[PDB]
């Protein structure tokens, strides 16, 4: 559902891009921005927007980025289990880590992971490294994380019966 944008959020630039469009005569140029948004507590969204200058671009992107947000469960500063997120040529593997190990993750994925309050996790990109598709694949892989309570509820069991 909508996690509504009413929190304390620390944004971050992940990329910018000089992008043209050839017209009669010469050339036009815009700037596209990629931004992440979160509160370092388990709510993270991404969003992009373009404008004619860099501040206006990053602004429209934070506008967009706040409209989407994901819940990102965790069990004590570490993801519940192992997931693989795939979105269009970007494949990203994520594993649970050891207490106080840090985040070993590449450029785009570490921004996403740090602004959700993840502390100890290992990653690897077995795919392409275009920033947009890496971010989208990472968020695609968090959405597969299952809480321990929900599984016990769906089946006819209790917890401490399946762990």
């Amino acid at each position: 559902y909508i996690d509504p944008k009413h929190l304390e959020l620390e944004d971050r630039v992940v990329a910018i891009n000089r992008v043209t469009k050839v017209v009669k005569g010469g050339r036009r140029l815009r700037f596209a921005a990629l931004v992440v948004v979160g509160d370092k507590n388990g709510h993270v969204g991404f969003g992009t927007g373009k404008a004619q200058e860099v501040p206006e671009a990053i602004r429209k992107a934070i506008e967009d980025a706040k409209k989407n947000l994901v819940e990102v469960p965790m069990v004590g500063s570490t993801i519940p289990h192992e997931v693989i997120g795939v979105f269009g040529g970007g494949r990203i593997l994520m594993k649970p880590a050891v207490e106080g190990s840090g985040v070993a993750a590449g450029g785009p994925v570490r921004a996403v992971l740090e602004l959700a309050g993840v502390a100890d996790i290992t990653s690897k990109s077995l795919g392409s490294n275009t920033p947009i598709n890496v971010v989208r694949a990472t968020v695609e892989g968090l959405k597969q994380l299952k809480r321990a309570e929900e599984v016990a509820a769906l089946r006819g069991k209790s917890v401490e019966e399946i762990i």
Binding site: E99, G100, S101, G102, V103, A104
Partner: protein, 201 residues
């Protein structure tokens, strides 16, 4: 080698005091050189991890090989975290013991006092500053010739005596009561940026 330079340019480059809050960053809190007051654009996330590592390396005045071996040694504990155990092993070296106890103002002075052979652990002299002081070992001041000018005066003016340090100002014996904690130790710089800096070394 150790280091002998102006020692104050160093603090202006890290943005941290490094000398017991006695202000090197009083006037001109910016960096040295021509392009000091005229700062420039952003710093990478490599510059940040490097700056944290350099802050910690210059705090206790050691070299890069020894810093890295101490870090590799702290990684074999697996009781707690890996940055906390590091910054705690860093504190148990005989130079910090003389600094904390209060027999010296700076850490350079404490280093020269332990190098020139003026202190003793358990009665026996020990001369090398990277020594590893364990918990519960009364380090003393060479009861042969403890009548020196600077040691005497720097015992009087106690700017900082901690909550893990024990001491008596008559026999001049000190010791650690127990191991410190991060709340009790510079909760200002880091121990996570430094751990990440060594992941890709």
């Amino acid at each position: 080698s150790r280091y002998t330079g102006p020692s104050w340019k160093v603090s202006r480059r890290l943005g941290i005091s490094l000398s017991g809050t006695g202000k090197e960053l009083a006037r001109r809190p910016y960096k040295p050189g021509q392009h000091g007051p005229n700062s420039r654009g952003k710093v990478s996330e490599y510059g940040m991890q490097l700056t944290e590592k350099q802050k910690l390396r210059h705090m206790y005045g050691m070299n890069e090989r020894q810093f890295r071996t101490l870090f590799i040694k702290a990684s074999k504990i697996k009781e707690g975290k890996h940055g906390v155990n590091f910054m705690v092993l860093l504190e148990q070296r005989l130079d910090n013991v003389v600094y904390r106890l209060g027999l010296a103002t700076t850490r350079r002075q404490a280093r020269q006092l332990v190098n020139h052979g003026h202190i003793t652990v358990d009665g026996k002299r020990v001369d090398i500053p990277s020594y590893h002081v364990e918990v519960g070992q009364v380090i003393g001041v060479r009861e042969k010739s403890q009548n020196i000018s600077t040691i005497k005066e720097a015992v009087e003016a106690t700017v900082g005596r901690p909550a893990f340090v024990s001491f008596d100002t008559e026999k001049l014996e000190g010791s650690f009561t127990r191991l410190p904690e991060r709340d009790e130790l510079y909760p200002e710089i880091d121990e996570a940026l430094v751990v990440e800096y060594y992941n890709q070394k």
